Design a protein around this ligand. Structure first.
Ligand SMILES: CC(=O)N[C@@H]1[C@@H](O)[C@H](O)[C@@H](CO)O[C@H]1O
Ligand SMILES: CC(=O)N[C@@H]1[C@@H](O)[C@H](O)[C@@H](CO)O[C@H]1O
Ligand SMILES: CC(=O)N[C@@H]1[C@@H](O)[C@H](O)[C@@H](CO)O[C@H]1O
Ligand SMILES: CC(=O)N[C@@H]1[C@@H](O)[C@H](O)[C@@H](CO)O[C@H]1O
Ligand SMILES: CC(=O)N[C@@H]1[C@@H](O)[C@H](O)[C@@H](CO)O[C@H]1O
Ligand SMILES: CC(=O)N[C@@H]1[C@@H](O)[C@H](O)[C@@H](CO)O[C@H]1O
Ligand SMILES: [Ca+2]
Length: 401
């Protein structure tokens, strides 16, 4: 499994794909269906700042296939429980949503945005999303048993929890396949080590196992505030490697193939602190922009977008300015204008969309990792129309696969 789930990007998108745009705005849930007709459509009078009292700092809103039909349902970790509005198949969703489990929630379970993490993930290879919470005592799971019926939460592993020292300002946690069986394992960038927890295919993980003594805060000086880190297949074998944007530039540790990891290696003198890159100003990604289907590099910098292509094995060609936009010099701010690298045309090669000041802007990969001219898609889901990071959530996501 190519699927990777991350703090930054808890709603993975498909490659190839024609992703849609989803906004959790004040009055409810809105979608822009990737198609010949580009318009906003309100679909759920809920999951909104004013529509149900939803709060960025108390609740979590995501999209995920909870039924197994490759349609994406709206999922909200609310005040008293978990609320799902399933996809009706026709640009509409069951409304109101159904409370499926009184847990994983602020007033049910004591969940806290600033202490814990909540994802949706197909962890048993059923075609459906199980509920996954990095809680206090460890990782908790609620089995998705089909038909909106979710099993009581059980401990999957007494690690990666708040009790074992995990902290959002110090550490990073991921779901990704590090062994090749297609089952998503825990990759955690802890205090001193980077650990692994192999997925036993049953809502449990085998005990943690350190695999790299680097890429952390007490092991390399990796900070959340300066040195982003991702998990992505860089070699092409559907197993996940490690990649961090450090001081000099990009470092990596390639998967052996069984989920033990190589050695840390400055593979590129750019996208790093020395090369000018700041989390405050700039967004850095890894996604496939070519037919090699491997992690290439994309950074939204000052002048524009910067791309470095992955030869096929972990090594990277020359950095280039693929477009003079989506950058800080064109007014793109991290705290105002979400940007995403995602396939919008269905060719396997990831494109670029940003929710800007007055419009949603797109920019299409030519198919080689070079890019076209910018497109003004629509004048909605923008600052000008009322969308802030403090009161709304926005995703690119595949509603239909
Ligand atoms: C933040 C949150 O959970 N909001 C929910 C809302 O979505 C739901 O419609 C209502 C049902 O009575 O309960 C509220 O608590
Ligand atoms: C933050 C957290 O871990 N919350 C959990 C809750 O989801 C679970 O039902 C319970 C199991 O006893 O323990 C609580 O602490
Ligand atoms: C944040 C962090 O690094 N936590 C780890 C924990 O997950 C592991 O169980 C333990 C044993 O090595 O070491 C702790 O310090
Ligand atoms: C944040 C950062 O860049 N950390 C790196 C560290 O991970 C690595 O082990 C070493 C290699 O020479 O250089 C440090 O400066
Ligand atoms: C923060 C930022 O934008 N950094 C870029 C850098 O990575 C690129 O290599 C260089 C070459 O033109 O231009 C800088 O301005
Ligand atoms: C933050 C933002 O939206 N910046 C855009 C810029 O990307 C675009 O090139 C220009 C065209 O008018 O308009 C600015 O508002
Ligand atoms: Ca594309």
């Amino acid at each position: 499994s190519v699927v990777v789930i991350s703090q930054a990007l808890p709603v993975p998108t498909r490659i190839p794909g024609v992703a849609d745009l989803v906004g959790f705005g004040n009055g409810g849930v809105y979608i822009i269906r990737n198609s010949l007709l580009i318009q906003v459509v309100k679909v759920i009078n809920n999951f909104g700042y004013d529509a149900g009292g939803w709060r960025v700092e108390k609740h979590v809103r995501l999209l995920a296939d909870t039924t197994g039909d490759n349609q994406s349902d709206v999922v909200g970790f609310g005040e008293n429980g978990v609320w799902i509005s399933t996809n009706n198949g026709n640009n509409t969703f069951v409304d109101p949503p159904k409370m499926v489990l009184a847990n994983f929630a602020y007033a049910a379970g004591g969940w806290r945005v600033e202490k814990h993490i909540r994802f949706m993930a197909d962890l048993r290879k059923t075609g459906r999303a199980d509920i996954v919470g990095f809680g206090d005592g460890g990782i908790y799971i609620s089995r998705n048993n089909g038909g909106g019926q979710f099993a009581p939460a059980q401990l999957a592993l007494n690690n990666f929890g708040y009790a074992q020292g995990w902290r959002l300002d110090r550490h990073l946690r991921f779901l990704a396949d590090v062994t090749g069986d297609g089952l998503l394992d825990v990759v955690g960038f802890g205090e001193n080590q980077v650990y692994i927890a192999r997925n036993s295919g049953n809502g449990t993980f085998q005990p943690a196992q350190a695999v790299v003594n680097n890429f952390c805060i007490g092991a390399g000086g990796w900070t959340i505030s300066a040195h982003p880190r991702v998990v992505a297949d860089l070699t092409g074998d559907r197993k996940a490697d490690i990649l961090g944007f450090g001081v000099a530039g990009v470092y990596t540790s390639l998967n052996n193939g069984n989920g033990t990891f190589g050695a840390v290696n400055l593979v590129l003198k750019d996208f790093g602190v020395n090369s000018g890159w700041r989390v405050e100003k700039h967004v850095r990604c890894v996604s496939s922009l070519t037919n090699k289907k491997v992690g290439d590099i994309i950074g939204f910098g000052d002048a524009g977008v910067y791309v470095a292509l992955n030869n096929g094995n972990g090594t990277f060609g020359p950095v280039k300015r693929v477009i003079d936009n989506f950058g800080y010099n064109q007014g793109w701010r991290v705290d105002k204008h979400p940007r995403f690298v995602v396939d919008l045309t269905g060719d396997g090669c990831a494109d670029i969309v940003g929710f800007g000041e007055n419009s949603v802007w797109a920019c299409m990969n030519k198919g080689d990792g070079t890019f076209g001219p910018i497109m003004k898609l629509i004048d909605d889901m923008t600052v000008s129309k009322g969308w802030t990071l403090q009161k709304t959530v926005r995703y690119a996501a595949n509603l239909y696969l």
